[PDB]
Design a protein around this ligand. Structure first.
Ligand SMILES: Nc1ncnc2c1ncn2[C@@H]1O[C@H](COP(=O)(O)OP(=O)(O)OP(O)(O)=S)[C@@H](O)[C@H]1O
Lengths: 266, 105, 191
DNA sequence: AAAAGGCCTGCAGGCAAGTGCACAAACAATACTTAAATA
DNA sequence: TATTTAAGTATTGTTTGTGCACTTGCCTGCAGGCCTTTT
């Protein structure tokens, strides 16, 4: 299912451009969290390698300037230069961010803007401006401590404040199990790749187009524009309503994640 | 949330155009106590911790000899706990009622 | 955790002072290698890249499973190393591969990965007591009893006619006089 | 000389040590009631 | 047929019980404050 959400991120949305309003964040954004050592970071590497525009980036080894380019009034010709937007390099195509929790509170605030408007409004001594950086962030995470506490509420087990959290279009909980049923399957799924010297197709031997799929994506995102038929509208509305009424409670206020309009946007 | 129009002028020497604005008879402290007793005896409420009915007449009699102190605390401080919680309350009051939008917080 | 013992503070101290006497910790039976040519051989080994052997996998796999399950029933327990991860499995495999490098051989041995397991477990239980016990050595009649218990797992009867029991005893090699003695004891023991 | 990236320290993030103690029930024998023995 | 009150009844009064609490250290979690550069 993680893979599924990732794929859906790759094809992200369509640019519905209104003459009134506008800037409806044509793409999506996927946090994912779970027990340490559960492939998250490696999935991120894998995606960043897949896309033709990815910009890997770590957390807590980066600052707000690194996340969103920084402007400079060049005194040479007295002009506006922009520099090194990690987010701006990813204009179009995905980004990746690790240790998203370990990110500083001084940082992790530019997100509060770029993720929902895809713009960065900088206003410092010399210059005020708004540089638009359309980009589908894709962040890893780590629940507080070093694993769950299934005696702890979930939206407290994740640390991020509810605004920024609902900002995220889709949150995954990759929990590690003590199955012993998949465990030996996973162990074989590693030992096999260790069997060969140059291991390929580590999983079941079903043909899959490692290279073809990229051109497939870069065709799909550019030759087809889905128009939401009428019937979809109904089942979408009812789905949202059911999502939210379920979330309704008196004590859901402090501990739960509430279904909000961004659920419908998602 | 009511438009609360209270104009003052009118036709010359009209004395009309009254200024009614509250338009909900907020009941006083002196009267509500009636409704409060009605409720507490309709069992929607209860005392903080009250043993309803003892096991037998022995423990019941031994608890009636107890000179209680909640007697001493006045009417408007007995900490009553609830019998029907707000969530359920939202599920039953027909939405036609003009207070329905307060069942939910 | 340095348990303050006596033979340690004896031997260690003696041998440090002996270093002061003879600047070589190597005693009568020892082959110390100078770090230069040591490094040489080490790098040479590093230039090998051995291969994982196909047989050991299952064993390896099984090891992981074991190292998994106990961990759960040891989460809140004393040795609170919590929920050994697939990274532990991968680290075991890597340790085995490096030991095979030390073999300078391209196929990992079952003894190789077994040594790796010994390393990973000696890291454990090194906290306290560091001891175990054994009780099942004697078994001159208790073994008969356990055989009977397997038979009971099959059917579960306290019959008064023993013909498969005596057959399995004779197959086990235990005599019939000791068997009859034990039967006496357990009938008196009311089973 | 000051304004903008970055990194260091004062406020307190917090909670088990822990005692007070305000809840409860029989409590030990109150205070009094009611049948009997004697003139 | 009635004064003896002796036993008995109904009731008081109180005993420790705890059920809950709310206190006062604790280092770390956090965040306003110091360093740097450019004009
Ligand atoms: N189901 C799995 N499929 C593939 N690799 C796995 C799986 N489970 C564990 N691994 C491996 O275990 C290691 C875990 O790496 P990651 O999970 O990406 O790192 P990480 O989980 O981000 O670590 P943290 O603590 O979450 S930051 C990698 O070597 C993975 O290849």
């Amino acid at each position: 299912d993680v893979k599924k959400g990732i794929l859906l991120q790759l094809f992200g949305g369509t640019n519905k451009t209104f003459t009134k309003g506008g800037r409806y964040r044509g793409d999506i954004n996927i946090l994912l969290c779970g027990d340490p050592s559960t492939s998250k970071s490696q999935i991120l590497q894998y995606v960043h390698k897949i896309t033709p525009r990815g910009v890997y980036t770590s957390g807590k080894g980066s600052s707000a300037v690194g996340l969103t380019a920084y402007i400079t009034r060049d005194v040479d010709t007295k002009q506006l230069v922009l520099e090194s937007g990690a987010l701006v390099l990813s204009d179009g195509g995905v980004c990746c961010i690790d240790e998203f929790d370990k990110m500083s509170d001084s940082t992790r605030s530019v997100l509060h803007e770029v993720m929902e408007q895809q713009t960065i409004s900088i206003a410092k001594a010399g210059i005020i401006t708004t540089l638009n950086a359309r980009s589908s962030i894709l962040a890893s995470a780590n629940p507080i401590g070093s694993r769950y506490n299934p005696n702890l509420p979930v939206t407290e087990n994740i640390d991020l404040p509810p605004p920024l959290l609902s900002r995220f279009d889709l949150v995954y909980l990759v929990l590690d199990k003590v199955d012993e049923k998949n465990d030996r399957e996973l162990a074989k799924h590693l030992t096999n790749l260790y069997l060969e010297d140059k291991p390929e197709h580590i999983s079941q031997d079903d043909v899959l187009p490692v290279e073809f799929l990229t051109m497939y994506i870069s065709y799909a995102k550019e030759h087809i524009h889905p128009i939401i038929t009428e019937a979809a509208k109904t089942e979408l509305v009812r789905a949202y309503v059911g999502m939210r009424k379920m979330g309704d409670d008196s004590r859901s206020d402090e501990k739960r994640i509430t279904a909000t309009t961004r659920q419908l946007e998602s | 949330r009511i438009p609360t129009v209270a104009p003052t002028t009118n036709v010359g020497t009209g004395q009309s155009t009254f200024s009614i604005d509250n338009t909900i008879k907020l009941w006083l402290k002196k009267d509500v106590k009636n409704v409060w007793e009605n409720l507490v005896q309709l069992d929607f409420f209860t005392e903080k911790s009250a043993v309803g009915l003892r096991d037998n007449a022995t423990a019941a009699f031994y608890a009636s000899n107890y000179q209680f102190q909640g007697t001493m605390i006045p009417f408007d401080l007995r900490s009553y706990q609830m019998q029907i919680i707000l969530q359920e309350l939202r599920r039953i009051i027909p939405k036609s009622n003009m207070y329905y939008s307060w069942t939910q917080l | 955790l340095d348990i303050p013992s006596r033979d340690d503070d004896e031997k260690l101290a003696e041998h440090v002072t002996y270093v002061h006497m003879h600047n070589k910790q190597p005693d009568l039976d020892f082959t110390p290698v100078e770090p230069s040519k040591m490094r040489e051989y080490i790098a040479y080994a590093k230039t090998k890249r051995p291969v994982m052997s196909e047989a050991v996998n299952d064993y390896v796999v099984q090891a992981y499973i074991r190292l998994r399950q106990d961990s759960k029933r040891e989460m809140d327990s004393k040795f609170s190393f919590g929920q050994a991860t697939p990274r532990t499995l991968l680290g075991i495999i890597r340790l085995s591969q490096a030991l095979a490098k030390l073999r300078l051989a391209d196929m990992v041995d079952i003894d190789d990965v077994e040594e790796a397991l010994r390393l990973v477990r000696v890291s454990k239980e090194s906290l306290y007591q560091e001891t175990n016990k054994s009780k099942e050595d004697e078994s001159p009649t208790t073994k008969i009893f356990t055989i009977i218990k397997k038979m009971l797992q099959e059917t579960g009867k306290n019959t008064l006619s023993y013909e498969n029991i005596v057959k399995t005893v004779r197959l086990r090699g235990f005599t019939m006089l000791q068997l009859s003695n034990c039967i006496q004891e357990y009938s008196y023991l009311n089973v």
